[PDB]
Design a binder for this molecule. Structure first.
Ligand SMILES: CCCCCCCCCCCCCCCCCC(=O)OC[C@H](COP(=O)([O-])OCC[N+](C)(C)C)OC(=O)CCCCCCCCCCCCCCCCC
Ligand SMILES: CCCCCCCCCCCCCCCCCC(=O)OC[C@H](COP(=O)([O-])OCC[N+](C)(C)C)OC(=O)CCCCCCCCCCCCCCCCC
Ligand SMILES: CCCCCCCCCCCCCCCCCC(=O)OC[C@H](COP(=O)([O-])OCC[N+](C)(C)C)OC(=O)CCCCCCCCCCCCCCCCC
Ligand SMILES: CCCCCCCCCCCCCCCCCC(=O)OC[C@H](COP(=O)(O)OCCN)OC(=O)CCCCCCCCCCCCCCCCC
Ligand SMILES: CCCCCCCCCCCCCCCCCC(=O)OC[C@H](COP(=O)(O)OCCN)OC(=O)CCCCCCCCCCCCCCCCC
Ligand SMILES: CCCCCCCCCCCCO[C@@H]1O[C@H](CO)[C@@H](O[C@H]2O[C@H](CO)[C@@H](O)[C@H](O)[C@H]2O)[C@H](O)[C@H]1O
Ligand SMILES: CCCCCCCCCCCCO[C@@H]1O[C@H](CO)[C@@H](O[C@H]2O[C@H](CO)[C@@H](O)[C@H](O)[C@H]2O)[C@H](O)[C@H]1O
Ligand SMILES: CCCCCCCCCCCCO[C@@H]1O[C@H](CO)[C@@H](O[C@H]2O[C@H](CO)[C@@H](O)[C@H](O)[C@H]2O)[C@H](O)[C@H]1O
Ligand SMILES: CCCCCCCCCCCCO[C@@H]1O[C@H](CO)[C@@H](O[C@H]2O[C@H](CO)[C@@H](O)[C@H](O)[C@H]2O)[C@H](O)[C@H]1O
Ligand SMILES: C/C=C(/C)[C@H](O)[C@H](C)/C=C(C)/C=C/C/C(C)=C/Cc1[nH]c(OC)c(OC)c(=O)c1C
Ligand code: SF4
Lengths: 83, 69, 98, 72, 115, 318, 172, 156
């Protein structure tokens, strides 16, 4: 706890490439854990529509599936417009 | 003096702009005054092939608008 | 596709003939083991592309991954064979008959 | 009398202020940028060239050149 | 087709300059002109003899690291997956074992050239 | 109309390559307190054409110990790959539009190392073999980091298409979010192109001329045209990737003019660098790249993998 | 253009014939580059792209190393070339005769099964999603980071262990 | 005739290219080679005449013999000269090279480099001043200017 500071100052003086390399390596593993945006990375990738959204046959027990795309139901990308 | 380097540096400059300008214009001259269509994925290639078929002159860049229906 | 696999498969056979028919250098026999990896990789790549099986396209990469390791391990051994007799001739590797 | 050209081991302590200076020297290539500066300054100096054969290098009256036989 | 045309055009220029270089000059061949160069004296031995490679271990370590490039080059497509946590974890580990492999070789004097 | 488009690429480049030889000799001149060429034409502008003509009237060499097939192939390959590296470059619209342009540049660049290897080996001379085995050592040095550096930059770009870098840099140079990789990228390009302080394959001081010591006349001219074309291309590539020129869809002429100014400036820094530094030792080139750049590049690869994830800044696929 | 793929696979075949006759590893490394390049063009013709350029990239770095090892360990005074020895020169020529014979023969006794010279080109691409977007081989290869993560574990471990393996093999 | 005129101007064209690109071989023997380095120095800047030193005799046009030629070095000088591609020119610079100079009567000195190679221009001095060498170099360009190879081929 006291010797480490001496070592770190020593390495930082004479080996900054490695001190920078470990810091950036370790800073890259923390930043996803604590950022409040890491969750959107999946969401934005899931919100990109490559395949055709094949419609489903409306039996009659679908009260939360839009009929027309401009219906007030279904997944919405407002969180992405205002992101 | 040092500005006597410029006569060669200016030639080299003119030479390096001919590639970019000539290619941009040649693309417009061979694509009906439009940028050469880029096709990265199969979907875009399909659009060009459809445009080539409905043009009437077998060229994808001869667009047909509401005149045609 | 039919004509391509026949030519690719015969390409693999020629390298298997090359590997099984030694000459002097051990390095030359190592290059035939890379002729075989290249033939197999191209067959797998064409098979997967023709059948549209995207989930099999990882496999051709692993073949290259596990083919380099052999090339590395093969070259590492070739260094030890050269450090002993000063060449890589196979005819020198014959002490073990007795 | 003699002097040391490459002796300096009167070792000091690496302060955090000084360690960060050594690192910036190493990471930012500062002394290599100083050398780039010296050749940039020379680019805007007047060249020392003379326009031979229209200009000639200076010579003195003692200059030993080609031989000759003189008269009275 | 364009990409085939432009490269034949490149090849034909390189060929065309090669032909002019050999059939245009006036050539005067004799043995002492066409001997190998070695700073003014005769070579003491052919140049085909073994040439020790003092960095051979790094050479084969280049192969192993070269194939580990082949595993990282799909990443631009991989960051398009829904399974972002998985993609990232696999990426971090892959780069970390390449680094751990590099550290071991560095500390074993593996990066040093054999004397 | 496509053949005319090759002319307006391969000819301006070749003219620009030649004058780079003149700009090199005059910038090196004034940096050394002299004038460089200025007699052969107004300020030497004809000096490049004199050197070319003289080299193609010089007797070509066919050494008795040489392997002629590869001896001839090597310079031909050298100049072909130098010109072929140019066809995908977007300025701002490329001659050949490739989805994986960056890999085409990586793969073409690597294959050009074999012109050094084959020529040196085919010369069957000791100094040419020393030069070839430095080409092997130099490539093993910079190859691993150079590819990974590109990977790091392309995770902000989204693809291996070169034309998509124009759109990535619409509002900002990639030099800012990436100046550590640009610094490491720039040094790699000096190693890729055998440029001082990394002219180890040639290295006139230690090897008389390295790989091309047995080459004279027009075959030797082709090697140089290749060397100086690559300088422009690698700096042209660095201008696209990191110093994104202004692109307005209505003013494609603006992008080319700005692209040229930055490519000329970066090409000058190669000439500036050659006048300023001593030459590396080729064992120390490996240590520079493997013990400094590589540890940093792996960390930056891991930094830039995570960076789009925790800022939700993943580039689009298209 | 209907013979295009057939010619590339024919060139690939020769490159491995020349390779099998095993001249000096300087030329054996030259055949692998040209076969590597030819084979790269085949994977491109069939619609690949990432797989084509990778096998070309990987074999460019492999032959660089192999060249360094040839000049140090597998070089003799008079390196052999395909024309160096009359006997090898015989089997390279004869080898090309055989393929011109095998293709012509096997084409005579089936006409469609193996070699269908009558129909070269008609059967290169079978299907293709004409309105697709996500079809590059890179997407399939990139599945190692999500779906076939097991592929990458064994691949990464293979390379990781290899560093330890070679350092011990070459150790003094 | 018209063809004989065209051949004349083609002769000037090829000469001009050889006049304007003389690449001397990096090669000096003794004190005369120090003054050859001064001619490359800024004040005279031979580079401004298109004169570039190249190390390899294959890439060199001109061999400047700048110092004493001893018997031990005589075969080696001839060998690098033979390996110069043609056309090729020799400038003999200094008394030592010109005729032995201060060592003419030495048992170990070649009494003039022109016993070993053909010499185009002789530059007197011990050493010649850098201008004297420069005058000699520029006197070699005028010699090339008077070259008449193509015209003589026409009259064969
Ligand atoms: C550009 C160069 C092309 C023109 C010169 C071609 C040389 C040549 O092959 O001459 C015809 C050849 C002679 O080749 P050559 O050996 O005289 O080529 C030397 C060229 N000159 C004369 C300029 C030095 O004629 C024949 O006898 C065979 C045909
Ligand atoms: C390749 C491009 C070729 C274009 C350059 C060729 C012209 C060379 C002459 C030149 O530019 O300088 C004038 C040169 C300069 O003369 P000069 O070389 O004697 O003068 C040099 C000395 N100072 C610096 C003091 C002037 O004029 C000539 O003497 C040569 C003329 C030959 C022209 C070639 C024939 C016509 C072409 C058929
Ligand atoms: C870049 C390209 C630069 C070339 C520009 C055009 C100039 C071409 C002039 C010929 C090239 C120089 C060749 C040479 O010097 O040999 C002269 C030769 C030598 O003449 P000769 O036949 O009298 O020499 C006989 C051999 N000796 C002297 C040793 C006994 O003359 C020629 O034949 C050249 C013919 C020129 C015709 C143009 C096409 C040639 C191919
Ligand atoms: C938020 C999170 C932040 C995350 C990012 C953090 C980034 C921090 C900045 C890191 C910058 C890294 C750049 C690379 C620097 C480097 O590696 O240089 C060190 C290298 C080693 O040189 P060396 O002799 O070994 O001295 C040190 C002892 N090891 O020395 C060299 O490189 C010298 C190479 C010079 C070769 C000549 C090149 C010409 C230079 C002039 C051109 C300038 C343009
Ligand atoms: C030595 C000779 C020079 C060697 C050059 C080596 C570099 C060539 C790399 C291969 C080129 C390549 O990567 O192919 C790209 C392109 C495919 O196009 P794509 O990326 O999919 O994007 C547009 C599709 N809509 O490909 C295509 O468009 C079609 C395939 C073109 C292949 C080019 C072959 C070069 C010519 C070699 C001739 C033989 C040399 C002797
Ligand atoms: C038949 C046409 C079809 C193509 C044929 C070629 C297929 C590829 C074969 C590769 C192997 C060559 O097979 C070759 O066999 C010969 C014996 O004949 C052996 O070669 C050995 O003996 C021969 C004969 O004296 C020597 O010339 C040679 O230097 C020596 O190494 C090797 O083991 C192998 O190099
Ligand atoms: C042996 C070698 C080992 C050394 C290397 C170790 C690397 C370990 C890296 C751990 C980092 C994983 O970091 C983890 O990222 C994921 C996604 O990226 C985050 O996960 C978050 O985002 C995802 C999508 O992005 C959401 O779907 C999820 O619900 C949410 O939790 C986690 O909150 C964070 O903890
Ligand atoms: C490295 C060496 C590479 C050389 C490789 C060989 C290149 C030449 C390719 C030979 C392959 C067959 O090449 C050609 O194929 C076509 C169709 O594809 C055959 O068939 C063609 O003619 C037949 C009639 O015979 C018709 O049905 C039709 O016009 C066409 O199918 C031709 O008879 C043959 O000439
Ligand atoms: C002792 C030596 C071995 C120790 C080291 C190896 C440890 C294992 C690490 C690799 C883990 C792979 O983990 C495995 O991933 C696959 C996909 O990637 C998951 O499998 C999944 O595949 C696809 C995902 O699209 C689904 O269609 C499928 O239904 C589902 O099971 C498994 O549920 C998980 O177990
Ligand atoms: C690099 C390119 C250039 C244009 C350079 O500017 C200059 C012009 C070339 C130089 C320096 C040498 C040219 C020829 C040569 C080999 C000289 C012999 C020599 N060389 C010495 O040192 C270098 C000596 O040192 C005491 C000597 O005694 C002797 C006798
Ligand atoms: S002539 Fe004079 S200056 Fe020249 S080498 Fe001889 S002694 Fe030295």
């Amino acid at each position: 706890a006291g010797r480490i500071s001496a070592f770190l100052k020593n390495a930082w003086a004479k080996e900054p490439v490695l001190v920078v390399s470990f810091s950036v390596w370790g800073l890259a593993i923390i930043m996803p854990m604590i950022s409040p945006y890491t969750k959107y990375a999946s969401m934005i990738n899931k919100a990109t529509p490559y395949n055709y959204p094949v419609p489903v046959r409306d039996d009659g027990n679908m009260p939360d599936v839009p009929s027309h795309p401009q219906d007030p139901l279904g997944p919405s990308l407002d969180w992405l417009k205002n992101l | 003096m040092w500005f006597e380097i410029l006569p060669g540096l200016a030639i080299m400059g003119v030479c390096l702009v001919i590639p970019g300008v000539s290619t941009a214009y040649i693309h417009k001259f061979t694509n009906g005054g439009k940028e050469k269509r880029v096709a990265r994925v199969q979907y875009q290639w399909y659009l060009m092939e459809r445009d080539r078929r409905i043009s009437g002159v077998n060229r994808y860049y001869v667009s047909k608008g509401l005149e045609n229906i | 596709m039919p004509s391509t696999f026949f030519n690719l498969t015969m390409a693999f056979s020629l390298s298997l003939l090359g590997t099984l028919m030694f000459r002097s250098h051990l390095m030359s026999t190592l290059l035939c083991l890379e002729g075989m990896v290249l033939s197999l990789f191209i067959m797998t790549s064409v098979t997967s592309l023709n059948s549209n099986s995207m989930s099999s396209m990882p496999i051709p990469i692993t073949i290259l991954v596990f083919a380099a390791c052999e090339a590395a391990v093969g070259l590492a051994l070739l260094v030890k064979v050269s450090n002993t007799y000063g060449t890589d001739y196979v005819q020198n590797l014959n002490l073990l008959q007795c | 009398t003699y002097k040391y050209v490459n002796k300096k081991e009167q070792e000091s302590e690496v302060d955090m202020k000084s360690a960060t200076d050594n690192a910036a020297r190493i990471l930012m290539w500062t002394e290599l940028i100083r050398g780039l500066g010296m050749t940039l300054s020379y680019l805007f100096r007047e060249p020392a060239t003379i326009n031979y054969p229209f200009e000639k290098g200076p010579l003195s009256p003692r200059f030993r050149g080609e031989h000759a036989l003189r008269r009275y | 087709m364009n990409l085939y045309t432009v490269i034949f055009i490149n090849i034909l220029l390189s060929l065309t300059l090669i032909l002019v270089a050999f059939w245009l000059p006036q050539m005067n061949l004799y043995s002492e002109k066409a001997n190998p160069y070695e700073c003014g004296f005769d070579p003491t031995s052919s140049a085909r003899l073994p040439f020790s490679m003092k960095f051979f271990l790094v050479a084969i370590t280049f192969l192993l690291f070269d194939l580990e490039i082949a595993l990282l080059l799909p990443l631009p497509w991989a960051i398009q997956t829904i399974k972002t946590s998985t993609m990232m974890i696999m990426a971090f580990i892959l780069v970390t074992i390449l680094s751990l492999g590099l550290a071991y070789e560095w500390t074993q004097k593996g990066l040093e050239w054999t004397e | 109309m496509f053949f005319i488009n090759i002319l307006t690429l391969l000819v301006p480049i070749l003219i620009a390559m030649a004058f780079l030889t003149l700009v090199e000799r005059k910038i090196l001149g004034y940096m050394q307190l002299r004038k460089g060429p200025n007699i052969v034409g107004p300020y030497g502008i004809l000096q490049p054409f004199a050197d070319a003509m003289k080299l193609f009237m010089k007797e070509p060499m066919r050494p008795l110990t040489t392997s002629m097939s590869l001896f001839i192939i090597a310079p031909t390959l050298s100049l072909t790959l130098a010109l072929s590296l140019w066809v995908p470059l977007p300025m701002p619209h490329p001659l050949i539009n490739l989805n994986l342009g960056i890999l085409f540049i990586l793969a073409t660049s690597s294959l050009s190392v074999y012109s050094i290897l084959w020529s040196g080996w085919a010369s069957n001379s000791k100094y040419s073999l020393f030069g070839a085995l430095r080409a092997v050592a130099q490539t093993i040095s910079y190859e691993v980091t150079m590819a990974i550096i590109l990977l790091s930059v392309l995770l902000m770009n989204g693809s291996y298409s070169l034309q998509t870098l124009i759109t990535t840099q619409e509002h900002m140079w990639l030099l800012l979010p990436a100046w550590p990789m640009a610094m490491m990228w720039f040094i790699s390009t000096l190693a890729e192109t055998n440029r001082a302080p990394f002219d180890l394959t040639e290295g006139e001081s230690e090897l008389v001329s390295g790989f091309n010591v047995e080459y004279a006349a027009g075959p030797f001219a082709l090697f140089f045209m290749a060397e100086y074309t690559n300088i422009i291309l690698m700096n042209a590539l660095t201008t696209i990737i990191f110093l994104g020129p202004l692109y307005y869809i209505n003013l494609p002429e603006l992008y080319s003019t700005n692209f040229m100014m930055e490519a000329l400036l970066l090409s000058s820094t190669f000439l500036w660098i050659r006048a300023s530094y001593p030459r590396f030792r080729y064992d120390q080139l490996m240590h520079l790249l493997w013990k400094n750049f590589l540890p940093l590049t792996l960390a930056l690869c891991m930094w830039h993998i995570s960076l789009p994830i925790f800022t939700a800044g993943v580039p689009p696929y298209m | 253009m209907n013979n295009y793929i057939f010619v590339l696979s024919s060139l690939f075949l020769v490159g491995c014939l020349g390779l099998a006759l095993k001249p000096s590893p300087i030329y054996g490394g030259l055949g692998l580059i040209v076969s590597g390049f030819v084979g790269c063009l085949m994977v491109l013709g069939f619609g690949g792209s990432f797989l084509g350029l990778m096998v070309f990239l990987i074999y460019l770095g492999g032959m660089l190393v192999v060249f360094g090892y040839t000049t140090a360990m597998a070089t003799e005074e008079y390196p052999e070339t395909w024309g160096s020895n009359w006997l090898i020169l015989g089997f390279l020529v004869l080898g090309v005769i055989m393929e011109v014979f095998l293709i012509c023969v096997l084409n005579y006794y089936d006409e469609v099964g193996v070699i269908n010279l009558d129909g070269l080109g008609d059967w290169l691409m079978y299907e293709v999603d004409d309105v697709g977007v996500m079809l590059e081989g890179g997407i399939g290869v990139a599945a190692m980071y999500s779906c076939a993560t097991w592929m990458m574990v064994v691949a990464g471990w293979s390379l990781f262990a290899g560093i330890f393996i070679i350092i011990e093999i070459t150790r003094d | 005739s018209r063809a004989e005129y065209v051949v004349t101007k083609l002769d000037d064209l090829i000469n001009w290219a050889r006049r304007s690109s003389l690449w001397p071989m990096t090669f000096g023997l003794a004190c005369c080679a120090v003054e050859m380095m001064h001619m490359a120095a800024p004040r005279y800047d031979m580079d401004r005449f298109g004169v570039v030193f190249r190390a390899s005799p294959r890439q060199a046009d001109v061999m400047i013999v700048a110092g004493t030629l001893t018997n031990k070095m005589a075969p080696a000088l001839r060998k690098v000269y033979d390996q110069m591609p043609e056309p090729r020119y020799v400038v003999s610079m200094g008394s030592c090279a010109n005729g032995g100079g201060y060592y003419h009567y030495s048992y170990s000195v070649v009494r003039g480099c022109d016993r070993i190679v053909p010499v185009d221009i002789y530059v007197p001095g011990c050493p010649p001043t850098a201008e004297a060498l420069l005058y000699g170099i520029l006197q070699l360009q005028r010699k090339i200017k008077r070259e008449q190879k193509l015209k003589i081929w026409y009259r064969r």
